[PDB]
């Protein structure tokens, strides 16, 4: 099977209530305290608004949750509440309901997000390190809290590039990691889906997020965003395999006794593992360092279990400038 190398027992060592989100009973505050100001976005299961808490004028984000089973709501809420105070995890300010419809909404702290599409083409090397480190803090935090985000992607990484403030948002796909639990591979967003998802390996873990983060890192340092630009989940793996190599994919599959969806036979082709330096060009050269590549190489590994953990990634020399700057 497969087990997270870290935080594999977080949840089992905690009270069941910590992870038994289905048993979680949110205290649903009154959404009437919030004035929706503007739609910020809409997901499959929610719409998100900038809002003002009219009681204290606090600008917040209200994520109005769509008619999904309350299980997923409880999951997100419980996860968010478990992650409360987690570094760079979006702060769930409150769980509120329209007091009449009882439609639940999550109130999050407001972040002035810098559009990642533009941001990622202008990040400096240090910025990337900085933000990746910030994101890793969130991931290490949530992983340490027994939670996989499972949808790490730029759209879920709010970066206020003015305040250098990063929040990992949208915990709606997040799940508690329980060793040996088989999870839905229909998580994350295509370009950020780890190979494990793409090969329907359900016994994944926090390291899925590290793949996604690796994808983000790759996109940031290489400025190819998304870095692995699959046209669909199949092609996503092909795109990955075109970089990480098909023999390496097969070794991964073999290690986890994964058999490919046979549809991959006629599309994976045969691809040598590419040197990450292959992605360096004049316009990203300044973002790419051996340390970045080494880190990336250790994140974008098929073998989810061999990917760096968030903490390991944070410990990677690539972030030394950030840590050094953090201290000094
Ligand atoms: C405003 C910038 N969009 C960029 C994609 C993020 C919108 N967006 C979402 C969420 C949250 C946000 C958001 C923006 C600012 C602060 C806090 C939050 C959230 O919690 C979700 O949960 C569900 C998906 C959408
Ligand atoms: Cl799942």
Curated annotation (Swiss-Prot):
Domain of life per record: Eukaryota
Question: SMART domains per the record?
Answer: S_TKc (SM00220)
- One of the record's GO molecular function terms: protein serine kinase activity
E.C. designation(s): 2.7.11.1
- Report activity regulation: Constitutively active protein kinase whose activity is not directly affected by phosphorylation. Seems to be regulated by level of expression and localization.
Pfam families in UniProt? Pkinase
N6-acetyllysine-modified residues are 91
Which SUPFAM superfamilies did the record assign?
A: Protein kinase-like (PK-like) (SSF56112)
Q: Where in the cell is it found?
A: Nucleus; Cytoplasm
The catalytic activity, as recorded, is: L-seryl-[protein] + ATP = O-phospho-L-seryl-[protein] + ADP + H(+); L-threonyl-[protein] + ATP = O-phospho-L-threonyl-[protein] + ADP + H(+)
- Please list the residues that carry the modification Phosphotyrosine: 7
Locate the residues binding ATP. Answer: 40-48, 63
Annotated positions of the Phosphoserine modification: 12, 15, 282
Return the InterPro entries for the record.
CK2_alpha (IPR045216), Kinase-like_dom_sf (IPR011009), Prot_kinase_dom (IPR000719), Protein_kinase_ATP_BS (IPR017441), Ser/Thr_kinase_AS (IPR008271)
Keyword entries, A-Z: Acetylation, Apoptosis, ATP-binding, Cell cycle, Cytoplasm, Kinase, Nucleotide-binding, Nucleus, Phosphoprotein, Serine/threonine-protein kinase, Transcription, Transcription regulation, Transferase, Wnt signaling pathway
The active site annotation covers: 151 (proton acceptor)
Q: Which GO terms describe its cellular component?
A: acrosomal vesicle; chromatin; cytosol; nucleoplasm; nucleus; protein kinase CK2 complex
GO biological process terms, alphabetically, are: apoptotic process; cerebral cortex development; DNA damage response; double-strand break repair; liver regeneration; negative regulation of apoptotic signaling pathway; negative regulation of proteasomal ubiquitin-dependent protein catabolic process; positive regulation of protein targeting to mitochondrion
Misc remark: Can use both ATP and GTP as phosphoryl donors. Phosphorylation by casein kinase 2 has been estimated to represent up to one quarter of the eukaryotic phosphoproteome.
Its function?
Catalytic subunit of a constitutively active serine/threonine-protein kinase complex that phosphorylates a large number of substrates containing acidic residues C-terminal to the phosphorylated serine or threonine. Regulates numerous cellular processes, such as cell cycle progression, apoptosis and transcription, as well as viral infection. May act as a regulatory node which integrates and coordinates numerous signals leading to an appropriate cellular response.
Report the family membership. Belongs to the protein kinase superfamily. Ser/Thr protein kinase family. CK2 subfamily.
The record's note on quaternary structure and interaction partners says: Heterotetramer composed of two catalytic subunits (alpha chain and/or alpha' chain) and two regulatory subunits (beta chains). The tetramer can exist as a combination of 2 alpha/2 beta, 2 alpha'/2 beta or 1 alpha/1 alpha'/2 beta subunits. Also part of a CK2-SPT16-SSRP1 complex composed of SSRP1, SUPT16H, CSNK2A1, CSNK2A2 and CSNK2B, which forms following UV irradiation. Interacts with CSNK2A2IP (via C-terminus). Interacts with SIRT6; preventing CSNK2A2 localization to the nucleus. Interacts with RNPS1. Interacts with HIRIP3.
Q: Which protein is depicted?
A: Casein kinase II subunit alpha'
Species of provenance: Homo sapiens (Human)
Q: Which gene encodes it?
A: CSNK2A2
């Amino acid at each position: 099977g497969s087990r997270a190398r870290v935080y594999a027992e977080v949840n089992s060592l905690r009270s069941r209530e910590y992870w038994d989100y289905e048993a979680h009973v949110p205290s649903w505050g009154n959404q009437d305290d919030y004035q929706l100001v503007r739609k910020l976005g809409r997901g499959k299961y929610s719409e998100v608004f900038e809002a003002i808490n009219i009681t204290n004028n606090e600008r917040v984000v209200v994520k109005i949750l769509k008619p999904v089973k309350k299980k997923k709501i409880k999951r997100e809420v419980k996860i968010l509440e478990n992650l409360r105070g987690g570094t760079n995890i979006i702060k769930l300010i409150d769980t509120v309901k329209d007091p009449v419809s009882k439609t639940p909404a999550l109130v999050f702290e407001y972040i002035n997000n810098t559009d990642f599409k533009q941001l990622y083409q202008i990040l400096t090397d240090f910025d990337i390190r900085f933000y990746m480190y910030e994101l890793l803090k969130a991931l290490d935090y949530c992983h340490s809290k027994g939670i996989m985000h499972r949808d790490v992607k730029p759209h879920n990484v709010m970066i206020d590039h003015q305040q250098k403030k990063l929040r990992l948002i949208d915990w709606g796909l997040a799940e508690f990691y329980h060793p040996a639990q088989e999870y839905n591979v229909r998580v994350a967003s295509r370009y950020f889906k780890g190979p494990e998802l793409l090969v329907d390996y359900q016994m994944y873990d926090y390291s899925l997020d590290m793949w996604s983060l690796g994808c983000m890192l790759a996109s940031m340092i290489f400025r190819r965003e998304p870095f692995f630009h699959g046209q669909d989940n199949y092609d996503q793996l092909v795109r990955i395999a075109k970089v990480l190599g098909t023999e390496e994919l097969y070794g991964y599959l073999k290690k986890y006794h994964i058999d490919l969806d046979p549809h991959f036979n006629d599309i994976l082709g045969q691809h040598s593992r590419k040197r990450w330096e292959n992605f360096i060009h004049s316009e990203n050269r300044h973002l790419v360092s051996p340390e970045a590549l080494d880190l990336l190489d250790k994140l974008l590994r098929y073998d989810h279990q061999q990917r760096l953990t968030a903490k390991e990634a944070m410990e990677h020399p690539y972030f030394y400038p950030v840590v050094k700057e953090q201290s000094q």
